[PDB]
Design a binder for this molecule. Structure first.
Ligand SMILES: N=C(N)N1CCC[C@H](Cc2cccc3c2OCO3)C1
Lengths: 348, 26
């Protein structure tokens, strides 16, 4: 039932792959739709206007020409309501950029290697999650500049962590990576709630060696994207399917899952083609009514999540679509590519 | 589905929290 028209496109002049794109879902109703792109040592902001206009706002160029941004995530200052943008990549440095001025406010060193994804907690705008090439996830409090917790170690991931997602209420995180596993880390445990409270009073970081659930029985290759769909999980590898699944047996409550739970239940698969290369994200809109994924030859797939597929193509769009982003009202869908191109699709 | 009801109620809580906020435009 969802139809789109390609109204505009452009190419960034660095000609390098764009790995991340995010609309600012914190902008208030009646304010312009803004999105950020990341790739090379660049972070660029654009504003969407009528008749498909993509207005370049400003660009951040890292002083380090060898930096390669892989991810970005929006938040806001909990005291001034000012928008904020976190970016990170190959250098493993988290930069908090003021998006109004495109200047870096501060940066965090910590991860032993590249940062593959950043996510902000859905209730607390100060809680930033980073997933890294060093096999760990890190939770930061960007108000007090503290490392709350490191999720890794004895039973942590055994290879690069590629993706992670908080659930809708921010009680838990599901991570995934190169070791083919998906691991659950509850952050509403008395231990984690207290560590978060202590980060505000500041530092001794929590070292969480053991996840609340783990499986290697969904995919048989690198797991490069994970998102919660209510109590269910959507995850993909390079096997031309997004798998919808849940820990435990069919009737098992996600909050009653024990850490040693050996079962998983597959609920369905979203099948597609030509997306068998590593490092390709899927995305959902705010209301989780639409699911989008680009493929390695520039096709954009869109599914209606309220029923269980629309294919968006343009003859000039033939490069791998690394990530997509819906505007908060789902009226606009942006796709970014391996050839530095950006595509704007408007919902009909 | 029951899962869709959880998505509706939980996204509604986040939407109400967003409606209470007035973040400065970029
Ligand atoms: N880990 C690496 N070697 N990287 C090089 C390629 C980009 C990687 C970041 C990334 C990870 C997972 C899914 C992705 C993604 O970018 C777009 O979709 C970082």
């Amino acid at each position: 039932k969802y139809s789109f028209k390609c109204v505009n496109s452009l190419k960034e002049d660095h000609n390098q792959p764009l790995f991340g794109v995010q609309f600012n879902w914190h902008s208030k109703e009646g304010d312009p739709l803004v999105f950020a792109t990341v790739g090379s040592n660049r972070v660029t902001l654009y504003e969407c206007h009528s008749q498909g206009e993509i207005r370049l706002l400003q660009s951040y160029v890292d002083a380090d020409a060898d930096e390669n941004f892989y991810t970005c995530a929006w938040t806001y200052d909990s005291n001034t309501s000012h928008p904020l943008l976190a970016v990170a990549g190959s250098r493993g440095i988290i930069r908090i950029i003021n998006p109004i001025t495109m200047q870096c406010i501060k940066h965090y060193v910590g991860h032993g290697n590249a940062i593959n994804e950043l996510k902000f907690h859905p209730r607390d705008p100060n809680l930033l999650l980073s997933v890294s090439k060093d096999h760990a996830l890190r939770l930061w409090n960007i108000q007090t500049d503290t490392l709350v917790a490191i999720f890794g170690g004895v039973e942590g991931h055994r290879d690069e962590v590629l993706s992670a997602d908080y659930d809708l209420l921010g009680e838990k995180i599901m991570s995934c990576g190169m070791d083919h596993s998906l691991k659950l880390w509850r952050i509403n445990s008395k231990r984690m709630m207290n560590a978060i409270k202590e980060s505000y009073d500041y530092f001794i970081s929590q070292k969480i060696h053991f996840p609340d659930f783990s499986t290697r029985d969904i995919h048989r290759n690198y797991v490069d994207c994970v998102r919660w769909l209510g109590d269910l999980i959507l995850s993909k590898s390079c096997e031309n399917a997004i798998v919808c699944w849940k820990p435990g047996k069919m009737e098992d409550d996600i909050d009653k899952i024990k850490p040693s739970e050996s079962n998983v239940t597959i609920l369905g698969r979203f099948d597609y083609s030509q997306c068998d290369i590593w490092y390709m994200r899927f995305s959902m809109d705010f209301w989780q009514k639409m699911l989008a994924l680009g493929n390695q030859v520039g096709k954009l797939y869109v599914w209606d999540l309220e029923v269980e597929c629309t294919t968006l193509t343009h003859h000039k769009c033939g490069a791998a679509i690394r990530q997509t982003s819906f505007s908060r009202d789902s009226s606009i869908l942006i796709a970014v590519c391996d050839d530095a191109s950006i595509w704007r699709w408007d919902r009909l | 589905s029951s899962n869709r009801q959880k998505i509706l109620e939980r996204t509604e809580i986040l939407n109400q929290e967003w409606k209470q906020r007035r973040i400065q435009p970029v």
